[PDB]
Amino acid sequence: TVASISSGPKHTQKVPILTANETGATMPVLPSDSIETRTTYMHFNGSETDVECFLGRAACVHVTEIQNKDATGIDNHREAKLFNDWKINLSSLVQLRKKLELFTYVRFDSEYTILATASQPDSANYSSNLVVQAMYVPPGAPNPKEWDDYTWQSASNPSVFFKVGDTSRFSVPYVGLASAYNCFYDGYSHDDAETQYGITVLNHMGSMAFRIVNEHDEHKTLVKIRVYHRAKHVEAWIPRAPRALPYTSIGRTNYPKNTEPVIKKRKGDIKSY
Amino acid sequence: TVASISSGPKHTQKVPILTANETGATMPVLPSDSIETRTTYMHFNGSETDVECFLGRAACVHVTEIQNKDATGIDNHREAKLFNDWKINLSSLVQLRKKLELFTYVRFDSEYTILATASQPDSANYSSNLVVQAMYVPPGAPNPKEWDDYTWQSASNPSVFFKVGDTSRFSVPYVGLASAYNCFYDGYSHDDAETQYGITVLNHMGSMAFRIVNEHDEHKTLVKIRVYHRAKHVEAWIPRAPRALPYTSIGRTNYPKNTEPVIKKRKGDIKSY
Amino acid sequence: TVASISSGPKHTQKVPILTANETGATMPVLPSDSIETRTTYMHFNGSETDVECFLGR
Amino acid sequence: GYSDRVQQITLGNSTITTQEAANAVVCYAEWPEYLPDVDASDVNKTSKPDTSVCRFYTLDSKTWTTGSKGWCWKLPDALKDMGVFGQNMFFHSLGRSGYTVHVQCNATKFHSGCLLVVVIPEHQLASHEGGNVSVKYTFTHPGERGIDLSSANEVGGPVKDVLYNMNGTLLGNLLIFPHQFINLRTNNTATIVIPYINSVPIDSMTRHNNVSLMVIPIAPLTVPTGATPSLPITVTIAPMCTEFSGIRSKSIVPQ
Amino acid sequence: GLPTTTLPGSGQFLTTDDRQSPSALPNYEPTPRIHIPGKVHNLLEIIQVDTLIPMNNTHTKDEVNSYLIPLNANRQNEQVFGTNLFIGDGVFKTTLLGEIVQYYTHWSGSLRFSLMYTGPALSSAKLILAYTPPGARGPQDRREAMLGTHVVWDIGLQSTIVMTIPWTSGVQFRYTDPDTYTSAGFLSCWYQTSLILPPETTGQVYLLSFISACPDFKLRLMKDTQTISQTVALTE
Amino acid sequence: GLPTTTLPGSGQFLTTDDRQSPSALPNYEPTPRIHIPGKVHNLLEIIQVDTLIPMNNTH
Amino acid sequence: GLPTTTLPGSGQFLTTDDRQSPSALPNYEPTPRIHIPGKVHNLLEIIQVDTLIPMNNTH
Amino acid sequence: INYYKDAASTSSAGQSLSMDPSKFTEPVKDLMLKGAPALN
Amino acid sequence: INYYKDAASTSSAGQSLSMDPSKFTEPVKDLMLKGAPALN
Amino acid sequence: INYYKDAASTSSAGQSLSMDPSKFTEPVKDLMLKGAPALN
Ligand SMILES: Cc1cc(CCCOc2c(C)cc(-c3noc(C(F)(F)F)n3)cc2C)on1
Ligand SMILES: Cc1cc(CCCOc2c(C)cc(-c3noc(C(F)(F)F)n3)cc2C)on1
C-alpha cells in the first residue's frame, strides 16, 4: 500500500486544491496534489483505530460499596449497606462514556469483570475470607430488601459467587430491545407534558445487587466493588461531535452552569506561534 | 564443524601471521597458521551468546514504593505515596543498562513482570490482602493526582490488577517512534543553547502509576514494587566499547569526578606473571 | 421462518376467527386471519424457553 | 451545460428550483427507502400516502440579522401541522420517513455571510439548568416555528448557547454530521436528503424526533452601506418514502 | 488429571487482554440487526472529515467568533494568522481531529488544512499559506514563510483552498502530546497582494479554517484523553 | 507440566454456567424411560394454550 | 472442565523462563524496520575483533 | 470433548428443537380446520 | 478453539478491514472529481 | 502453538544462526587474503 506516489512538476487546468466546502464534502486532497513527492509505503493497517479495538478494552463503569457487620436491629439493610445495588448504566464514569458517545448508535456484546476489595478501617484481629454474591435483577424481578431475602436464592436470575480480593468474569450478549443501543435519544416514553427526556427512558436495564454471603464477624468489614466493562463484536453508527463540556448527570447531555471555556485562549496574537 | 584442521610443518613465502593492524582489520589467523595441529570438532553452536539470549532474560529495572494508609488530611497523595509513579526507562539499574549499552541501536519486544511485596513495619493484627493497580500513563494522558482519581478508571490506558505477594505479567510490542531504540544519542530536541543533551530527550515513554485499590486498614501497609524486563525478538546494531566507569545519572554517559582507576595496577613488573 | 405472511382484504364464507372454546381446543388463529398483514420473519428460535434451559441453571 | 449550481427537485405536486446551489448532500450516502420485510417487526400492513404527504412544505420565514444566533427545527415535529402528513402523524401509532431539506437565503454580490445547515440524528438537547433537570415535551416540540437560539432560557426548556450545540459539544465539530454551507458569495440554497435513521424499523412520530435541522450563522451577516440590515431565511421540507402503521384514534399531545 | 504449571501473571486482570468468558445469559437470542446508515469501522475514517478550527482563540470565552479569521482590506505583506502544529493542543485541541488524535500517543501522516473565503462575491484577494517544517522558527514575514512549503491562493469562484501539510519528518512517528524533538513545525498565512472590497461595502470579511487527515494518516498506542474528567461519580 | 495462566474469574461460581463435573455416583444405572404422554419441550408450547382471564377484578 | 493437577513450581517467577504472555497493547503496529548497518547477531562475532591490551598496568 | 466416563457428568443437552403445541392446544378427537365451522 | 456454546462469550472480532470514509467525506448527490471545478 | 493474537506476545526467537564477524573484523575496501602481504 503506497502512502504517497511519485509526483513531479505541474502546470494544469486541473486544480485539485481548489474546492467549495459549502458543498459539505471534504475532497480527498493529497500531498502529491500540491507538492512534488517521492514514493513511500504505508507499512500500516490501522488495526488499533478499529472500533472493535477502540471500545474493546475494559473500563471501570461503576464503584459501589457493601459491608459485613451485625444486622441485628438494622431496619433498612439497603441503607446500612448490608447489601447494595447498582442501577446498571454506562454513563456514570466519564472516561468510557465519552468514547461511546463518539457515536449515536452502538451494538456489541459485553464482558464484565467485577473486582471486590476488603478494608477494615478500625480494630480487627484478622482479615476475613468473605464471599461476594452479585445477582442480576432484571426489570420485573423482585428486588432484595434484606441481605438474606428469598430473592438471593436466584433460581432464575443469574448470579456469581466469588471471593473478596478476587475477581469475577463473564460476558453478556447484546441485550438491547432495539437493533442497537442508543447513546442519545431525542424523545420521551410517551406524549406527556412532564415525563423525562433522553436515553434515561430508554436505558432501563434493571440493576445488579451485591451482598456478602458470610454472617458477621466481631469486627466490621468494608467491601468496595468495582465493575469493569469491555465491549466485543462492536458495531457503531452515526459519528458525532465529541463531548466538550463536563457532564452533570447520568443519561442527560446537560452541562454545568458557569462552566469554564474549553477552547484555550491564546497567550498573544492570532499571529502567535 | 571443525574447530581445527590437521596442519603439519611449514616453510613458505606465505606468511599468514604477519599483518598490518593499521589497516583496521583483524585478520582471522588460526592456531593451524602458527603451530602443527590435529583435527578437532566444535561440538558447539554458540546459542547462549546470541543477542536474543543475551538480552532475553528478566532483569530488575526499577524498584518503587506505595503504601496503604488513611488518606484523610493528606494534601499531596503522590508525596504521601498513597500512589506513586515511574518515569519509564531502562537505565536506572546498572546491570541491564551495561548489557544494552553494548550496542548503539536496539530493537525488541518487551515482557514485563511486576512483583509486589507487603511489609508492616509496626504493630498490625494481620497482613491484609491488598490489590495493586498498575496503569500505563503514556505521554499526553492525564496523570493521577489522588489515589482515587477519575484517572484510575483507565478507560483507554491499559492497566493490571493483581494481588500483593503475587506477580503481574504481560508483554509490550516495540514502541519506539523510530525503527529502533537509541542507547545513545549525540543530539538535542532542537537547536537551543540550553536544552538537554542525550537520549534523555529521546526516551520520553511516559510513566506507569501504581496504587493500592483497597481502602485503608487500622494499621499501615508498605508495598514495595519491583519491575522486571525481558527482551524478546531482539535486534542489535553498532557494537561499542563496554562501560568502564560507574554511572551517575539516567540517560547521560556522565561519570563521577575523582573516580578510581578501573584498570588493575600490577603488584610488580610489566614482566610479572 | 416467517412470523407473519402477507395477507390482504377478505370476504369469505371461511371464518377463522369464529370458534367454540367448549371443545377444549385453542385454535391457532393468527393476526393474518383478522387483519391485513405484511411479511415479517421470526429471527428467533426459542432457545431460552426450552425446558433444558428453564431448569438448567 | 449542466451545473452543480442549477437544480430542480420535484416531489408530489411541488417543485423547487435553484440557480445557485452547491451540489446536494445525501446523508451518509444513502437515499431514503421504504422498510423491507427482512427488517420489519410490526405485522401491520403499512400505509403509503405517497404524493399526498411526500411533497414540499414551506415553514415560516426567519429573519437573519447582524445578531442572530441560529435556529433549530426538529423532524417530524416541524411538519406536525402540515396537511395530510401531519394528520397521518397523529392518527397512527407508528411511522417512518425520510426528507429532502431545502434551506433558502439570497442576497447580493455585495453582501456577505455564511450559514451552516446541518442535520443531527438523535439531537438530545441539554437543560440550561444543568444538574439532572429534564427538558419538557413542549420545548422540544416547537413545531413549524422552531427554536430560536437567540431567545432567552425558559423554565423546562433547553439551553440555547450556539457555541455548545445545545448539547455540550463544540459548534466547530458539527461538520461531522451531514451538512452544507450557505455562503452568500457562493450559495443561496442548501439541500440535504435525509434517509430514515433509527435503531428501530419504525417508530412513534410524536414522542420521538429522529433528527433536528439547524441553520447557524458562522460568518455574520454583512449588508452593503445603508442597506436593510437583515435577510430572510426560508426552510422548505418534503417527506419521502413515508410509511404509517397502526391506525387508530388520533393522539392528543402535551399542550 | 493433566499435569500443569501456573505461570506468573495468573489471576491478574489486564484490562487490555482479549479472552473468552462464560455467558451469563445462555441461549439468549439478541434482537435482529436492521440496516442503519452511517456505520463507522475505523476512527481513521472519520478524521478524514474536516471540522472548523477555532483559529481565533483570542476571546475571553468560547464563541462563534473564535472560528472567524479576520481579514483586513488594503493591507500589504502582513500576516493573517499563525500557529504551531501540535495537533494535540492549541487551536487543534478541540477539533474532531485533535479530539480523536488525543486518544492515541503517536501520530504520523499528512494533514489537510483548508480555508474558505466568506467575503462578498465582488471582493477579491490573494493570500499565501505556508508550512514551515521543523528546525527553524515560525516565519516572521512573508519572505521567510515563502521559502518553505506554501500555496498562493487566489480567491474566486471556487471558495475554498486546500493546502496539504505533507508529512515532513525524520523519525516516522510523532507524539500527540506536545514534545519538542517531535515538533511538526508552523503554519502561517499572509497577504500575497491584498484584500480589495467593492464600493458601498465596508468592514471585515472572515476566513473559515478546516482541519482533517489525509489517507496518509496513522495513529497508535491508545490512551486516555485529557479532554474529559470528573470529581465524583455521576448520578441519575 | 503444561504451562498455564489462570484468568480472572477463576474459582467463581456463575449459577448460569454450563460445564462438566465428575459424577458422585459412578456406574449408577438410572431407571429405564417409559412412555409418558404430555411431554413439554418449550414453554412457548404451553403459552399457546389459552386460560381464563380474571377480567372482572372488581371483587 | 478439564481435570488438571498443578505441579511444584506453579506461581514461580524464573527470570530465565521463556513463555508467552498477553500483550498490553493489542493491535499496536510497530514502526517499520529500516536498514541499519552493523547488525550484531552473536557476541562471539564481536570478540573476534581485537582491542588494545593495557599490558603496561604499572601506572 | 467429554472428560468423564458417566453421561450424567456431561453439560446441557442443547435445544430439543421439536416444538409441537398441538398436543395441548388441539387435543380433540375430530380434526378441526381453521376457517371451517368449529361445530358443524 | 471456542470453549463456550454462546457467541457472546467468544473473544474480539478482529479488524473489520472495510474502511470507506466516503460516506462521511463525500456524501454528495453529484459525484465530484478531484481536479474538476467543484462548482461548474 | 501460539495462544495470543499479537506477535509481541510470542516467546523468544531462537538462534539467528547467521554469524558473520567480517563486517567488524574485515571492514576493508580491498580484500586482504590471509598469507598474502597485508601491505603490498
Ligand atoms: C448502554 C448499555 C448497555 C448495557 C448492557 C448492560 C448489561 O446488563 C447486564 C449486566 C450489567 C450484568 C448481567 C449479569 N448476568 O449475571 C450477572 C452476575 F454475575 F452479575 F450475576 N450479571 C446481565 C445483564 C443483562 O447497559 N447500558
Ligand atoms: C529503551 C526503552 C524501551 C522501553 C519500552 C518501555 C515500554 O513502555 C511501556 C511499559 C513499561 C509498560 C506498558 C504497560 N501496558 O499495560 C501496563 C500495565 F499493566 F502496567 F498497566 N504497562 C506499556 C508501555 C508502552 O522503554 N525504554
Ligand 1 atom nearest E25 alpha carbon: 15
Closest CA–CA distance from residue C57 to any residue of chain A (Å): 7
3-class secondary-structure state, position A236 = strand
Q: What is the number of the ligand closest to the CA of E9?
A: 2
All residues at 6 or more sequence positions from E102 whose CB lies less than 8 Å from its CB, including other chains: B140, E88, E93, E176, E225, E226, E227
Residues whose CB is less than 8 angstroms from the CB of residue H6 and which lie 6 or more positions away in sequence, other chains included: F23, F25, F26, F27, F28
d(CA E107, CA E92) in angstroms, rounded, equals 14
3-state class (DSSP) for residue F44:
helix
Grid cell digits, residue D229:
440590515
- Entry resolution in angstroms? 2.5
Amino acid found at D108: T
DSSP-H helix ranges across chain F: 43-46
Smallest Cα–Cα separation from B164: which of B210, B106, B102?
B210
Residue D217 CB partners (closer than 8 Å, separation 6+) = D64, D68, D69, D70, D113, D114, D115, D116, E64
The answer to whether the CB of B168 falls within 8 A of the CB of B227 is no
Q: B135 in ligand 2 pocket by Cβ < 6 Å?
A: yes
Cβ count within 10 A of residue E170: 8
Judged by CB atoms closer than 8 Å, whether chains meet at F22 and H9 is answered as yes
Interface partners of G (3+ CB pairs, < 8 Å)? A, B, E, F, H, J
Q: Which residues of E touch B170 (CB under 8 A)?
A: 9, 12, 14, 16-17
The 3-state DSSP class for residue A160 equals strand
Q: Is B108 in the pocket of ligand 2 (CB under 6 A)?
A: no
Task: Judge whether D135 and D167 are in contact, CB under 8 Å.
Answer: no
Residue E45 Cα to ligand 2 midpoint, Å, equals 28
How many alpha carbons lie under 13 Å from residue B14 in its C-beta half-sphere? 8
Q: Which helix (DSSP H) or strand (DSSP E) does residue B108 occupy?
A: strand B103-119
Q: Report the C-alpha gap between E154 and E126 in whole angstroms.
A: 5
Q: Verify whether the Cβ–Cβ distance A232 to I11 is below 8 Å.
A: yes
On whether any CB of chain A is under 8 Å from the CB of D47, the answer is no
Q: How far apart are CA B48 and CA E142, in angstroms?
A: 62
Cα separation, E44 vs E48, whole angstroms? 7
Neighbours of J39 (CB within 10 A): 8
Asked if residue A119 lies in contact with residue A195, where contact means CB atoms within 8 angstroms, the answer is no
Task: Give the pairing type, strands E2-6 and G4-6.
Answer: parallel
What's CA B268's distance to the chain center, in Å?
39
CATH value of D1-255 in 3.40.640.10, 2.60.120.20, 1.50.10.10, 2.40.160.10: 2.60.120.20
Could A48 and G32 be called an inter-chain contact, meaning their C-beta atoms sit closer than 8 Å? no
The DSSP 8-state label assigned to residue I4 in this structure reads: S
Q: How far is CA I24 from CA A52, A239, D178, in A?
A: 19, 9, 7
Pairing of β D189-194 and β D25-26: parallel
Interface mutation target, options C40, C41, C48, chain E, most CBs of E under 10 Å: C48
- Chain H residues in contact with G5 by the CB 8 A cut-off are none
Query: Phi and psi for F13 in degrees, rounded to 5?
Result: -120, 100
Instruction: Please state, in angstroms and as integers, the Cα–Cα distance from residue B9 to each residue in A200, B37, E182, following that order.
Output: 98, 10, 65
User: How many residues are present in chain F?
Assistant: 59
Nearest-CB residue to F9 (from A154, A159, A167): A167
Q: Which has the closest alpha carbon to E71: E112, E131, E130, E120? A: E120
Residue B74 CA from chain centroid, whole number: 34
Minimal CA separation from E4 to chain A, in Å: 22
Compute the distance between CA of residue C43 and CA of residue E33 in angstroms, rounded to an integer: 10
What is the distance in A from the centroid of ligand 2 to the CA of B179? 17
Residue appearing with cell numbers 478500625: A122
Q: Looking at A45-146, which runs of residues are DSSP E strands?
A: 59-68, 83-87, 103-119, 131-137
Whether E74 contacts chain F with CB within 8 A: no
Rounded to an integer, what distance in angstroms lies between the CA atom of residue C34 and that of residue A207?
40
Name the closest ligand to CA B230.
2
Check chain E for breaks (C–N over 2.5 Å) and list the residue before each, or none. Answer: none
Dihedral, CA atoms, D167, A245, D68, D210, nearest 10 degrees? -20
Contact between chains at A197 and D134 (C-beta distance less than 8 A): yes
Of B12, B25, B29, nearest to J28 by CB-CB distance is B25
SS3 annotation, chain D: CCCCCCEEEEECCEEEEECCCCCCEEHHHCCCCCCCHHHCCCCECCECCHHHCCCCEECCCEEEECCCCCEEEEECHHHCCCHHHHHHHHHEEEEEEEEEEEEECCCCCCCEEEEEEEEEECCCCCECCCCCCCCCHHHHCCHHHCEECCCCCCCCCECCCHHHCCCCECHHHHHHCCEEEEECCCCCEEEEEECCCCCCCCECCCCECCEEEEEEEEEEEECCCCCCCEEEEEEEEEEEEEEEEEECCCCCCCC
Cα gap E19→J3, rounded to integer Å: 10
Q: What is the CA radius of gyration of chain G?
A: 23
If you write DSSP's letter for every residue of J1-40 in order, what string do you get?
A: ---SSSGGGS----------THHHH---SS---TTS-S--
Contacts of D164 (CB under 8 A, 6+ apart): A244, A245, A255, D126, D170, D171, E62
Q: What domains appear along chain H, each with residue ranges and CATH number? A: 1-40 (4.10.80.10)
Domains and CATH numbers, chain A: 1-273 (2.60.120.20)
Distance CA E190, CA E142 (A): 6
- Could you count the other beta carbons within 10 Å of the beta carbon of residue D31? 14
Residues contacting E147, CB < 8 A, separation 6+: none
Is the CB of residue E33 less than 8 Å away from at least one CB of chain I? no
Instruction: Name the minimum distance, in Å, from the CA of G22 to any CA of chain A.
Output: 13
Distance CA D85, CA D79 (A): 7
The minimum-distance atom of ligand 2 relative to the CA of B181 is: 1
Q: Under DSSP, is residue A7 helix (H, G, I), strand (E, B) or coil?
A: strand
Q: How crowded is the C-beta side of A78, counted as CA atoms within 13 Å? A: 7
Q: Do B153 and A93 touch (CB under 8 A)?
A: yes
B206: CA distance to ligand 2 center in Å?
9
Instruction: Tell me the shortest Cα–Cα distance from E132 to chain G, in angstroms.
Output: 25
Which protein residue's CA is at the shortest distance from atom 27 of ligand 2? Answer: B89
Residue D213: CA atoms inside 13 Å, Cβ hemisphere, count? 33
From residue C23, alpha-carbon distances to D176, F51, H30 in Å are 64, 14, 10
* Ligand found nearest the CA of A168: 1
Taking only Cα atoms into account, the Rg of chain D, rounded to an integer number of angstroms, comes to 18
Q: Is the dihedral of CA B96, B102, B105, B106 positive or negative?
A: negative
Atom of ligand 2 nearest to the CA of E221: 25
Interchain proximity C40–D43, CB inside 8 Å: yes
- Ligand number nearest CA of I8 is 1
Strand D189-194 with E218-222, pairing: unpaired
- At A155, list the grid cell: 433460581
Place of cell 558473520: J20
Q: Which residues contact B245 (CB under 8 A, 6 or more apart)?
A: B255, B256, B259, B262
Inter-chain touch I23–D24, beta carbons under 8 Å: no
β-pair partners for B221: B68
Beta bridge partners of A118: A223
- Chain C residue with Cα closest to F52: C21
Residue with cell 433444558: C52
Minimum Cα–Cα distance from A98: chain B residue? B155
- Residue A170 near residue A91, CB atoms below 8 Å: no
A-I Cβ pairs (cutoff 8 Å, strict): 72
Residue of the CA atom closest to atom 4 of ligand 1: A89
Identify each DSSP E strand in F1-59 by its residue range.
2-4, 13-14
The nearest CA of chain F is from the CA of H32 a distance in Å of: 16
Which of E184, E52, E221, E186 shows the shortest CA–CA distance to E109? Answer: E184
Contact D56, D11 (CB under 8 A): yes
CB distance B162 to B117 below 8 Å: no
- Residue E150: CB partners within 8 Å, gap ≥ 6? E128, E129, E130, E131, E163
Residue of H nearest to F42 (CA): H19
Angstrom CA distances, B5 to A157, B1, B37, B41, stand at 80, 10, 7, 9
Distance between Cα A95 and ligand 2 center (Å): 21
Cβ-contact D212, D47 below 8 angstroms: no
Chain F residues near residue C46 by CB distance under 8 angstroms:
42, 44
Which residue(s) pair with E201 in the sheet?
none
Cα of J28 to nearest chain G Cα, Å? 13
Burial class (CB in 10 A: 0-12, 13-18, 19+), C31: middle
Residues of A whose CB is below 8 A from D177: 240-241
- The conformation of residue A114, written as its DSSP 8-state character, comes to E
Tell me whether D93 touches chain C (CB under 8 Å): no
Helices then strands, each counted (H, E), chain B = 3, 11
Q: What angle do CA A134, A138, A139 make, to 5 degrees?
A: 140
Do residues E53 and E210 lie in contact, with contact meaning Cβ atoms separated by under 8 Å?
Answer: yes
Angstrom distance (rounded) from CA F41 to CA B41:
76
Helix (H, G, I), strand (E, B) or coil at G4: strand
Q: Would you tell me which residues 200-229 of chain E have a C-beta closer than 8 angstroms to some C-beta of chain G?
A: 218, 220-222
Ligand nearest the Cα of residue A108 is 1
CA B155, B159, B162 angle in degrees (round to 5)?
A: 130
Among E residues 152-191, those touching chain D with beta carbons less than 8 Å apart:
157, 159
Tell me how crowded residue H18 is: count the other CB atoms within 10 A of its CB. Answer: 10
Atom of ligand 1 nearest to the CA of A100: 1
Q: How far is CA D82 from the centre of its chain?
A: 14
Cell of F50: 389459552
E94, E207 Cβ separation under 8 angstroms: no
**Subunits adjacent to chain H (3 or more Cβ pairs under 8 Å):** C, F, G
Dihedral, CA atoms, D80, D82, D84, D85, nearest 10 degrees?
Answer: -50
Beta-carbon contacts of E178 under 8 Å, excluding residues fewer than 6 positions away, are E86, E88, E89
Cα(D140)–Cα(D146) distance, integer angstroms = 9
Residue D90 grid coordinates? 397523529
Sequence length of chain H is 40
Answer left, alpha or beta for residue D99, where phi above 0 means left and psi between -120 and 50 means alpha.
beta
* CB-CB contact of B77 with B147 (8 Å): yes
Instruction: Extract the C-alpha cell encoding A151.
Output: 430473592
Query: Residue E96's closest CA among E216, E220, E213?
Result: E213
Q: How many whole angstroms separate alpha carbon D225 and alpha carbon D222? A: 9
A37, three cell numbers? 513527492
For the stretch F30-54, what's the b/e string if a residue is b when 16 or more beta carbons lie within 10 angstroms of its beta carbon? Answer: eeeeeeeeeeebbeebeeeeeeeee
Can you say whether the dihedral through the CA atoms of B16, B21, B27, B33 is positive or negative?
positive
Give the closest-approach CA distance of C42 to chain F in angstroms: 14
CB A122 within 8 A of CB A128: no
Look at residues E33, D249, B193, B24 and name the one whose alpha carbon lies nearest to residue A235.
E33
* H10-to-A34, C55, D123 alpha-carbon distances in Å: 68, 16, 52
**Residue with CA at minimum distance from ligand 1 atom 21:** A159
Domains and CATH numbers, chain E: 1-236 (2.60.120.20)
Kindly tell me the sign of the dihedral angle through the C-alpha atoms of E48, E49, E50, E51. Answer: negative
Q: Do A191 and D174 touch (CB under 8 A)?
A: no
- All three cell numbers of B141, joined, read 494522558
A–B interface: beta-carbon pairs under 8 A: 74
For residue D253, give the nearest of A186, A190, A199 by alpha carbon.
A190
Q: Is the CB of B167 under 6 A from ligand 2?
A: no
CA C27-C30-C36 angle, 5° bins: 145
Residues with Cβ within 8 Å of residue A190, at least 6 apart in sequence: D207
- Answer whether A159 contacts ligand 1 (Cβ < 6 A): yes
Out of G1, G3, G19, the one facing F3 most closely (by C-beta) is G19
Q: Across chain F, which distance is largest between two alpha carbons, in Å?
A: 72
Phi, psi of B53 (to 5 degrees): -85, -40
Q: Can you tell me whether residue E45 is helix, strand or coil?
A: helix
